[PDB]
Write a protein that holds these residues in place. Structure first.
Motif, short mmCIF file in Angstrom:
data_model
loop_
_atom_site.label_atom_id
_atom_site.label_comp_id
_atom_site.label_asym_id
_atom_site.label_seq_id
_atom_site.Cartn_x
_atom_site.Cartn_y
_atom_site.Cartn_z
N UNK A 22 0.51 -1.07 0.47
CA UNK A 22 0.09 -0.10 0.34
C UNK A 22 1.01 1.27 -0.18
N UNK A 23 0.26 2.28 -0.72
CA UNK A 23 0.95 3.20 -0.73
C UNK A 23 -0.04 5.05 -0.62
N UNK A 24 0.56 5.85 0.19
CA UNK A 24 -0.91 7.09 0.07
C UNK A 24 0.31 8.02 -0.93
N UNK A 25 -0.68 7.89 -2.13
CA UNK A 25 -0.24 9.62 -2.77
C UNK A 25 -1.31 10.34 -3.41
N UNK A 26 -0.26 11.47 -3.10
CA UNK A 26 -0.92 12.56 -3.27
C UNK A 26 -1.66 12.88 -4.49
N UNK A 27 -2.04 14.73 -4.34
CA UNK A 27 -2.14 15.20 -6.55
C UNK A 27 -1.15 16.83 -5.82
N UNK A 42 2.96 10.79 -0.28
CA UNK A 42 2.80 11.19 1.19
C UNK A 42 3.10 10.62 1.92
N UNK A 43 3.56 8.99 1.80
CA UNK A 43 4.06 7.71 2.54
C UNK A 43 5.52 8.11 2.18
N UNK A 44 5.91 7.09 3.01
CA UNK A 44 7.84 7.38 2.88
C UNK A 44 8.36 8.79 3.15
N UNK A 45 7.23 9.58 4.37
CA UNK A 45 8.65 9.87 4.36
C UNK A 45 9.21 10.96 5.41
N UNK A 46 9.78 9.31 5.93
CA UNK A 46 10.56 9.18 6.61
C UNK A 46 12.04 9.93 6.15
N UNK A 47 12.18 9.10 4.69
CA UNK A 47 13.73 9.65 4.14
C UNK A 47 13.25 10.25 3.05
N UNK A 48 12.29 10.24 2.57
CA UNK A 48 12.19 11.66 1.35
C UNK A 48 10.83 12.35 1.51
N UNK A 49 10.91 13.38 1.82
CA UNK A 49 9.81 13.99 2.27
C UNK A 49 8.63 14.56 1.66
#
Lengths: 400, 167
Positions: A22-27, A42-49
């Motif tokens: 699963x992944x949280x993708x934004x517009x 939006x997700x994986x914001x630990x290393x790539x904001x």
């Protein structure tokens, strides 16, 4: 329970389950330079904001289908189901519309989504629907409600299309769920008070200097260096900073003391990072870790409270002002404080007056950080500057 | 007509997989492969149902439905909005050059033969879709259509002496 009023900032996210993950993708939307939108992680914001500045839209009007067709054939309202909304991009100022051309060859009948200047026609309007049977038409939309956006012109759904590299949202006939994250509720934002997501800078009480980096006359290795500077640097594009909050909802609320946030440079697009073997420098988003890039503002020098404020889901309270609000920078890892140095020896002291900013424990009791926000003109100008210099460096490399 | 277009676009599986979908290209290659299947008996029942003829008839029926479902002869479409919207939807769903290519196939004119193949009535559905969705209002477009899709069939129809098996 919070209702979606008009003239408030929201973010449109969604979940994609690809590769059995699963992944949280934004517009998001670049605005200047290109018209079509794209996706932001939006997700994986630990290393790539995620670049929160460009995924923020504002609802202008909420009219029914009859009123829409009626005005088209010719106030703090409330979002209702079945209505039609107008999503103006907060940064670019254009309006979200359904384009006519096609880019993804996988969908020979779907249309692209992008931005346009004028609000004429049925392209810039989007009718809203629920994604559950518990909420019917004419009901009030609340935070977290799963909605479906349908184009008024093409009568197509805002679909999340999948591709190897064409991870591009399109206008297809298969629906896709979209979640609404509020940022600024459009309520009384306290003038002169610090608001999240602002583009501002810092100054000293009796030094008249600001935190900045060297100009473009030096290379990127020196532009990565950080210092204080005065003079005409008081009004420059390379002197502004952005407080990117780690939260995806209500990030544009009243920033309170102790909460973490990254400090982004609007001209270079990098963050103030810290490795213990050196001092603080600038590094890109592809490795921006929450530890090394998270900072906070304290009211004193002691360590009386660190892990006290956890999460507030609302607009907050007007606490930090711009003029009479002496902040102190504090890292989430080391807890050091700003110190101005004398890196310039007496042999060239009357030359380029430059005092480097080292983070240390003791510090000097004369900092007096005063906030000063930059206007929309300078903020947009700095952002577009970064955009065209990036694109032009890309073009120069590709041509050379 | 409006609610039929709405239901058809809501459920895109109703269209043929050769026309709609991430696979097949469109009605040109659909019709060509259908003619190939009708000619090759290895893809049929070894009075049987000719699969190629059935595919051709299905696609012709879909095109005829969409054509007769086109808004009007621009009586209300001249000053109406949803009519223009439905027309644009039909135009985006069915390309024009594809229709011209399907019209321009120039079937044979045969000792009789079997009419369980590319029936001349399959061309009538494409002609009706052209006349109703797009129409004939451009001189060079009319001339090009007349050259590529009308003259061969006109010659085949004019070349009859006695053996008239297909009226």
């Amino acid at each position: 329970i919070q209702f979606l009023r008009t003239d408030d900032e929201v973010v449109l996210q969604c979940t994609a389950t690809i590769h059995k993950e699963q992944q949280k993708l934004c517009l998001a939307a670049e605005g200047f330079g290109n018209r079509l939108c794209f996706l932001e992680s939006t997700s994986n914001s630990k290393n790539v904001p995620p670049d929160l500045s460009i995924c923020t839209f504002v609802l202008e009007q909420s009219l029914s289908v009859r009123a829409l067709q009626e005005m088209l054939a010719n106030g703090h309202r409330t979002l209702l189901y079945g209505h039609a909304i107008l999503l103006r991009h907060s940064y670019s100022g254009m309006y979200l519309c359904c384009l006519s051309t096609s880019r993804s060859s996988t969908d020979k009948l779907a249309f692209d989504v992008g931005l346009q200047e004028d609000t004429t026609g049925e392209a810039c309007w989007w009718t809203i629907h629920p994604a559950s049977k518990q909420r019917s038409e004419g009901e009030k939309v609340r935070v977290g409600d799963d909605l479906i956006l349908v184009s008024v012109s093409s009568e197509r759904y805002l679909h999340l299309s999948y591709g190897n590299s064409s991870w591009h949202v399109d206008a297809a006939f298969q629906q896709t769920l979209w979640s609404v994250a509020p940022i600024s509720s459009g309520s009384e934002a306290a003038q002169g008070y610090l608001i999240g997501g602002d583009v501002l800078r810092l100054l000293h009480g009796h030094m008249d200097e600001c935190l900045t980096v060297p100009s473009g006359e030096h290379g990127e290795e020196q532009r990565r260096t950080v210092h204080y500077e005065g003079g005409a640097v008081s009004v420059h594009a390379r002197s502004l900073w952005r407080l990117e909050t780690l939260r995806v909802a209500w990030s544009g609320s009243h920033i309170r003391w102790g909460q973490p946030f990254r400090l982004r440079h609007v001209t270079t697009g990098k963050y103030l990072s810290l490795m213990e073997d050196k001092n603080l420098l600038l590094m890109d988003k592809e490795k921006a870790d929450v530890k090394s890039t998270a900072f906070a503002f304290r009211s004193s020098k002691e360590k009386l409270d660190v892990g006290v404020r956890k999460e507030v889901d609302g607009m907050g309270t007007s606490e930090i002002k711009y003029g009479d609000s002496i902040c102190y920078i504090q890292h989430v890892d080391t807890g050091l404080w700003l110190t101005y140095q004398a890196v310039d020896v007496k042999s060239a002291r009357m030359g380029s007056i430059q005092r480097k900013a080292i983070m240390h424990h003791e510090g000097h009791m004369d900092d007096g950080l005063n906030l000063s926000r930059s206007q929309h003109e300078e903020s947009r100008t700095a952002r577009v500057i970064r955009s065209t210099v990036f694109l032009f460096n890309r073009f120069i490399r590709g041509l050379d | 007509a409006n609610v039929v277009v709405r239901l058809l676009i809501r459920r895109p599986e109703c269209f043929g997989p050769a026309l709609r979908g991430e696979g097949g290209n469109g009605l040109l290659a659909a019709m060509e492969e259908a003619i190939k299947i009708a000619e090759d008996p290895s893809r049929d029942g070894p009075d049987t149902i000719h699969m190629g003829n059935a595919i051709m008839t299905f696609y012709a029926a879909l095109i005829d439905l969409l054509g007769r479902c086109a808004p009007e002869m621009h009586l209300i479409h001249a000053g109406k909005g949803e009519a223009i919207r439905i027309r644009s939807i039909l135009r985006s769903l069915i390309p024009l050059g594809d229709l011209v290519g399907v019209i321009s196939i120039a079937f044979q004119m045969p000792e009789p033969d079997m009419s369980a193949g590319f029936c001349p009535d399959h061309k009538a559905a494409m002609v009706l879709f052209l006349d109703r969705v797009y129409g004939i209002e451009v001189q060079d477009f009319l001339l090009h259509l007349l050259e590529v899709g009308f003259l061969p069939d006109l010659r085949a129809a004019a070349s009859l002496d006695t053996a008239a098996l297909s009226x």
